Structures are given as C-alpha cells and as structure tokens.
C-alpha cells in the first residue's frame, strides 16, 4: 500500500516501497508530520526506492515514516474559484479566506502544446511605455522577457505592466511569484486589493487575478514547481475557459536556481558554471507550455534576473531563445537616473519588422537605435577631446541622442510613491510622432533636460515653459519672504509651546506578557524505550 522514508538528505527524501512503485512526477503525502509535507517523485533509485523532492521542510522526518502514494501528480484547484485567491505550490489557500471552491482540480504536469496548434498572428500589445512600445514592441499572445540584474527595476516594470495591461485587458491574469521577496508579494496583493483587481468576500467572483506564490523562504522543491502551478492555472484559463490570459512570472530565474539546489542531491554531476545538466530541457519543458494555442491565448511577461549583470550566464542565456520580445534592463542606464532603465539597443522584439508594425514605426525605431549607437561610438572621443571640434554633424547627433535618451524615460504610476512625479501613459501613435520630431529635428530649440521624466511630446514643450519660468525666478533677494517674522509666523519659542508632550515608561513592557518557563541546567535525553531520562554520567 504505502512506502516508508529511507533517507533524508536536505530537501531530498528517499522513499522505499515494497512493490508497486509510484510513477515519476507523482505526488506523495507524508503522514505523521506536523505540517502537510508533499513529496514529488524525481527518479527511481532502483532497489524499490524512489528519490523525491519535498514541497515543504524536511525537518522532522523519521527513517521509516509512512509515506502514502496519491497515484497522481500535484493537483491544484483551477477555475473561477481561484480568481482573487493566493495559492501555494500545492494549491492551498494562504490568503486565510476559506477553502478554494474551484471544480476540476488539475495536475501541474502536462506536456507542451504540439506543433499544429500554434498561432502565427502578430498583433502589438500596447503598454503605454514609450521605450517598450517604440523600440521593442510587445506582442499580444506572446512571451516577454524582462532581463536585468538586482535593483534595476524588474519588479517596478512588471508592476507597471500589470497596472497598464491587466486592468484594461478583460480576461484573467495569473501572477506567479517564483522565489521572490514575500514583502513585495504582499505589496502586489495590497495594491490589487485597492485597485479592484482582487475583491474579497461575496464579490470575490468579480476578481481578475489569481495569485500563486513560491517565495524565497520556501524550500527549493516549492520554488521549482510553483511556476507549474501558476502555469496550469493559466492553462485552464486558456484551454477550457477559452479566455486570453496574462501570466506574469516574477523571476523565472528562480525556477532554474531551485532546480540547481537539488540536482547534486539527485545524483547529477554538475554542468557548466554550477547549474544542473538538465537546465535547457527543464526550462524548455516549462516554457513551451506557455504558448498561444488555437483554443486560447497566454500573454506571458517574465522577469529574468541576470546574475551580477551577466547576460552570458547560462540561465538567462537559455531563457533568451524562448521569448518573442526581450526588455533588457541595464544598470548603467539606471546610473544616469533614466527610468525605466531599458537598454535601447540590447532590447529586441519579433514585432520590430516593417511588415508588421508599419514602415513609419519601424523606421523611426531604427533611426533612434542608429543615433544612439552613433552617440555610443562618440562617447569614447568625447572623454578625450571634449566635444568641441566635431564640425556640427557629430555635435548635432550627440544632442539629438541625448534628447532621445532623456525622452525614453517615463514616470510610472507605480513609482509615484518613491519619486513623487505622477505617472504617464503614452500611446503608440503618440510616441512615434514624438520620437520622429526629435529625430528629424523639430525640437532642437527645446532645452536638453526638458525631455526628462515626461509623457508625451506635449509635455517637454511645457517643461520647457516651466524651466524658463523657474530660471526667470531666483533673480531678486532684498526682503519680503517667509524669514521676516512680521507676516504670520510666531516666535521660535512659541512654536515649541505647540508641541504635545509624549509619555515615557522606562520599563519597556517585558514583565507582564511573557511565559517565563524553566529550562533545566542538565541535559535531558531519551533512552532505548523512549522514556525521558537525564544524561547518564558515564562517558
């Protein structure tokens, strides 16, 4: 019937069965454990033993603990009952709001959609971000990679992508938090409680987002499989409901990282730099399920953390081929103060094609990339010569590309709470003309800093107005400002009198709520019969 725990090394449990072994990728329950511990069969060890990875911590497991087979892989609730809920890797509600009332629980493991059911149409997903929609335009029904190191703005960009696309999409979205901070998961959950994407109580069914969370405090088995749980929620929303789905995956790098933490304990000799030998095929088996079939559509946005800003690291370098669009975020762009820190050259999309987006959009994007590459080639001789002799053809292409660099920046709606500037949504025909004007030369009379952190081209020519009014200030300094006390302001000692004085306890509250139990000086052991005895004084 059941099996027993044979070996526990870290997050990898060897379970021995006496006849009728479970299949690979089957789910096993451990009973006698405090919390619900789910093991997924990774391989067959060979002498009627399976080797498993755990979905929770293996602290507490006993060699010989009864492990029961489920006869199926990890099954999770999918459907309309999961909208507005937070799930585990194994489909438990962790939002503390009842059970998940969804019918037809599905396995998280299936094969990829086959070759004949592949869609070939390409329509542009307009996001409102004038560096995304211009240079590397996204595709609805396509896969999007948000590359970039630690601190460059992947989570802020995916928050703005949620706040732009997923609210005005109609269909359902799925967020898969794969190995990230729990604090920003709580931030996303709160910011979708207020914005009405997630609703609570009786109006729960009017929610449009399903959260599946596998964050950093989880063991490496729970981070390796939580992307499959978010993906099978999105696959139910694509295949059965027929809807068009959004699948935001925060740090798909942590999938490969979580598979790397267990692969030495699974008996695999290591590959290149320290990843598993099965890196490309695990990533392919995950990512080929995220497709647009003939039944429905999944538009996936994926953050990819590059380790130490290395794009040649094999875990993002494998990810690069599975994506339709690619938004590489660069640290040196964010060091200029430009946000979002999208590399305007290194970002690529399949939609940048004159046969798809039009020969005006394509040519203005190629012209912006041409003038930015020209400025990047001139940045060498500027720091040795000084940009004074370049004979007004290379001195103009520096100023135009600097206006383009400042014009690629954009204030975000989600970044108001740490910049202050209100966010901007810039439409596609509204950014093509705005970049065509600064490309052809319609805005050389404007100041260079006026392009920084604005929206449309009808905002740079108002920041020029406000800049030339604000430099029209700071002109006179005789008197009549706030510092002369005669206007409306009290003395400095009278403002002190307006302070309410707070209490000071000086006892810190540590003597009234603590259950100060007694701990033994001697150490207490268990003998052969399991009884609690003191340690025997004979070494």
């Amino acid at each position: 019937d059941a099996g027993y725990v044979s070996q526990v090394i870290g997050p990898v449990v060897d379970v021995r069965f006496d006849g009728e072994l479970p299949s690979i990728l089957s789910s096993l329950e451990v009973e006698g454990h405090s919390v619900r511990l789910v093991l997924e069969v990774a391989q067959h060890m060979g002498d009627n033993t399976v080797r498993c990875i755990a979905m929770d911590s293996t602290d507490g497991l006993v060699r010989g603990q009864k492990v029961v087979d489920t006869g199926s892989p990890i099954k999770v609730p999918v459907g309309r009952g999961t909208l507005g809920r937070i799930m585990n890797v194994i489909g438990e509600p962790v939002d503390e709001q009842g059970p998940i009332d969804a019918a037809d629980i599905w396995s998280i493991h299936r094969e990829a959609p086959e070759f004949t059911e592949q869609s070939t149409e390409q329509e542009i997903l307009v996001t409102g971000i004038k560096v995304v929609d211009l240079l590397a335009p996204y595709q609805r029904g396509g896969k999007i990679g948000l590359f970039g190191g630690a601190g460059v703005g992947k989570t802020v960009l995916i928050m703005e992508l949620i706040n732009n696309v997923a609210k005005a999409h109609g269909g359902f979205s799925v967020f898969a938090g794969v190995g990230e901070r729990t604090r920003e998961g709580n931030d996303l959950y709160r910011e979708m409680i207020e914005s009405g994407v997630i609703k609570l109580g009786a109006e729960r069914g009017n929610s449009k987002c399903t959260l599946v969370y596998g964050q950093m405090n989880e063991p490496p088995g729970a981070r390796a499989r939580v992307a499959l749980t978010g993906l099978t929620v999105a696959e139910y929303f694509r295949d059965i409901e027929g809807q068009d789905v959004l699948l935001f995956v925060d740090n798909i790098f942590r999938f490969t990282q979580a598979n790397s933490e267990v692969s030495a304990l699974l008996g695999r000799i290591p590959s290149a730099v320290g990843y598993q030998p099965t890196l490309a095929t695990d990533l392919g088996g995950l990512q080929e399920r995220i497709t647009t079939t003939t039944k429905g559509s999944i538009t996936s946005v994926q953050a990819v953390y590059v380790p130490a800003d290395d794009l040649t690291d094999p875990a993002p370098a494998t990810t690069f081929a599975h994506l339709d669009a690619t938004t590489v975020l660069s640290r040196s762009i964010a060091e200029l103060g430009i946000y979002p820190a999208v590399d305007p050259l290194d970002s690529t999309s399949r939609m940048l094609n004159p046969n798809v987006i039009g020969a005006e959009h394509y040519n203005v994007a190629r012209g912006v990339q041409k003038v930015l590459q020209d400025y990047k080639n001139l940045q060498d001789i500027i720091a040795i010569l000084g940009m004074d002799e370049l004979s007004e053809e290379d001195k103009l292409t520096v100023a135009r590309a600097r206006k383009i660099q400042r014009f690629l920046s954009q204030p975000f709606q989600v970044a108001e709470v740490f910049t202050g500037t209100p966010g901007k949504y810039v439409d596609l025909a509204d950014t093509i003309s705005g970049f065509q004007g600064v490309l052809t030369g319609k805005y050389d009379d404007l100041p260079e800093m006026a392009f920084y952190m604005v929206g449309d081209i009808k905002e740079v020519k108002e920041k020029a107005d406000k800049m030339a009014k604000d430099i029209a200030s700071r002109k006179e300094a005789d008197n009549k400002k706030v510092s002369e006390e005669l206007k409306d302001i009290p003395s400095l000692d009278k403002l002190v009198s307006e302070i309410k004085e707070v209490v000071i306890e000086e006892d810190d509250g540590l003597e009234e709520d603590f259950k100060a139990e007694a701990l033994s000086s001697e150490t207490v052991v268990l003998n052969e019969e399991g009884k609690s005895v003191p340690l025997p004084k004979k070494n």
Partner: protein, 523 residues
Amino acid sequence: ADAKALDELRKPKFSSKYLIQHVSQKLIPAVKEWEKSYQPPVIHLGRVLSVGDGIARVYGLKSVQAGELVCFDSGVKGMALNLQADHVGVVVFGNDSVIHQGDLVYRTGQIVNVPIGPGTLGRVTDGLGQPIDGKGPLTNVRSSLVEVKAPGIIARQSVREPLFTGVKAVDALVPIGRGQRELIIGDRQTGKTAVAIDAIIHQKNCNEQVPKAQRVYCVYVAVGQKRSTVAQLVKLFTQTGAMRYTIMVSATASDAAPLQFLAPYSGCAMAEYFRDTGKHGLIIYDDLSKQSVAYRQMSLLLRRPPGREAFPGDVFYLHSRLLERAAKLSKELGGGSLTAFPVIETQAGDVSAYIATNVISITDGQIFLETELFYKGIRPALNVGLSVSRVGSAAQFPGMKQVAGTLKLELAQYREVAAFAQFGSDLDAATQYVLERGARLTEMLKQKQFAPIPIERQTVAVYAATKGFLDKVRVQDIVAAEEAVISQVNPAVFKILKANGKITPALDAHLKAELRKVKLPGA
C-alpha cells in the same frame, strides 16, 4: 541477480540438515566465549561508527528526526543532519576530540532550540544559547526553535516606520525601513561593522526618548570573528549603555563549524521574540560570508557534492530562509517588526562573487563601501551610485525627504562631471559650479565613528548645504562648518523639527533666519 529469485530464497530449499542441527547447538556456546568483546546492540540509542573533523557517523538512532539535537555520552551536543539508510550524519556542537568509536549517542527529542525572551536582553551568548559572559545562566527566558518559517503574505504589512541609523549618509541617501533587510557590503576594513555599531548606538540614544513601543532591541550576531573583537564590542556597548537593549550572539572562530552556521539562526530566533510580541527588533548578521563558509565546511565533511567555489547547491536557501524572517507584521499579529543588516565581505571589490550576489538578490537595499572612497577621506565610504534601497520614500523622515532629493540629484550631477576632471575647461561656470557644490555635499556627508547623530540634526545639516549657507567656505572645513551649524543654531529648532517630522512653513523661515545668525569659521 534480480530480486525475484532473491525473494525465492526466503522460502526454505535446503533438502538436508547436516549443518543446521549441528551448529545451532554450537553457536550459543561459541558466542558466549566472546561476550566481553561484544558491545550491546543498539536500536533507539546511537553508537559512533566514525568520528572526525566535527562529523560523527552514528549507527542506530532509529527514530531521530532530521535536524534534531542529539547528545553524545561525553556531554557534547550534536545535530542529526543527513539521515542515511545505515547511519546518521551528526555534526558536533563543539570539539569532537571527546567522541570515540563506540560512544553512545542519545536522542534528545528536540529539534534545535535557543532560549528566547527578555532574559537574553543584555547577555553575551554563544551560537547555541548558552551565556558566555560569566554572569550565570539565563533567567526569565523560554526555549524556541531556530527553524521558524518566515511570516507569509497575509501576516505582513507595508514598511512605513523609519528606524533611523544615526549615519547621515545612510539616513539621507539609503533610508532604512523598520522591517527592511539592508545589506552592508564591502571589502575588508571598509567600515561595515562601524555602520552596524553606530546603528545600535543610535537605537540606544532613541530608546530613551520614544514611548515604549517604537523602542528598538538590537541583536548582534558575530559569526567567525575573533573573541577580542567581540569583547571590545561588549566593552563599547557597556560603556555607552547600549547593552541594555542589545543581545550579542557570539560564535567565534574557535567555535565549531555548526555553531557558526547556526548562530545567525540563533540570533534571528532571539530577535523574533520582539517581532512577535509587538516590539521592534534590529538584527545584524555580521560576517554572513563566514556563516556561508562554516556551512560549506559542514556540508563538505558530510560528503555532499560541492558547487560554485565548492559551496553547497542550497547555499542560497541558507540565507534566503534566514533573511526572509525579517518582516513587518500586520496589526492582528502585533505590528512588530524586525530589520536585518547582513554583512558580506567581498574580495578586491568583486561584487560578482557567489554569496555576495545571492545576498544582494535576497535583501531589499544595499550599502556599498568602497576602499577607494575610504582612503579619500569619505567616511563612511558609501558608494552613492551603487547603494540602493527599495523603499525610498515612505520610510524616512518627512523633513529629510524634502531635503535629500536635492542631495540625491546633485550628487548625481557631481558624479557625471567628475569623470572629466583631467582637463579643467570649467564649461560656462556650470560644470565648475556643480562640482563645487558636490564636493561640499560629499564633505558634508562625512562623520566620525561611534558618534551617531539624531535625525533632526542631520536634516538641519543637509538643509545648510542643499540651500546656500555654505557656498562661502572651502571644502576643507565643512566638517567643522557643520559642527558650527549644529552647535550655534538654537536647539529649539531641533525640538520643533522632531515633533513635526517635516519642516512647517513657520520652521523653514526660522531655519533660514538662524543659518545667517551663526558665525561659521570658514574663510
């Protein structure tokens, strides 16, 4: 060779019995001839097969749990880490020279736990919970596990309260939050312990001023440091009074590798008491790159396969499950917080190391300490283009938020100009002016050691540089000009600015009034 005839052999097929009835009455008189050489058999107790380098392979111990405290017969404790099929791999909490082959190992019944509570507040502790300061055992304290799972999404709330550190470079540019994990990273002797220590001293200075619930209880975990440094830190914290709110967990270099591995978890479990009982905690994991090294040794001697720089594969999970326990709880869980300050030492400024990149990807903010800024007089050596924080606004002083934006922008103006400092053309007196203000700002941001500043005296001092009031002095005496500013501006400004939090429109008036009323000696 397969198991089917191997199970058929369980059925008897001997067909003759001319040895079975001969040796069965000959076995027991033979075994009794050697019963003083036999050791008694073992099932639920343990017996040491092999011991060496801090690892005991223990035969028996049938019902041990993974990660369970065991106790050898010589008194030294252990921890059952990898439970293999024929033996248990036990790491030794101490010197393994008192363990022999054939020593009895006793299962204690408990997963590893430390004493938590208010009784630890003021003690110097080892990495396992025993006090090492020579002041007797721990009283008014209770035992709690060191492997508590971090609070989830519904248990947390957004980080809003500041927890100032007293270092005005930090509190102006990289503002901490009260439940935020902030990594102090740099080379050796670049001032990381100084930043953590000044943070603890400033919590001592603020705990005697706030009403009993914004009080911050520091916990310092010294991993891998020598014992003279820990004793000097205890002398510092007692001679300034910071030891009344500070716990110190000290697994030194002489301790075993599992003690240094377990000491950040012991310190986090001691600091989670204040987080779970509504108070606010501050935890400093000094030398987390030494806890990773102790974990590497402990796992390599358990014969687990090595990875990048021979580290374990799960060395990311080691620091992620530790640092994720620093949270800000919801109001139904008390609202208590715990803010982490892990420390990583880099080698020659290589930020692309394995443990360094892992802990950068785990924590919220970063505090980079470069060794070239340290020797240029900039103390603390904050790398302002690389030190990031996730919170930014809504986690700092509202008065400092109005002033430090003009600092964050103008230091960026200074940095993009100073890469053209070989020629000196001084373009239109604008590239000359922005460096002539940015040098003043970097000289403003310097401060001494073991002397933290209250936040009002910081946001007055940056007010005197983001505005005018210091353009008349050279860059060589701004560290004395700001002493003239704080020393001669009337101290009733600081009370109003602390009680308001921001500058009221009656307060920036009086502050611009009194920054010309003072005589600064800059000539």
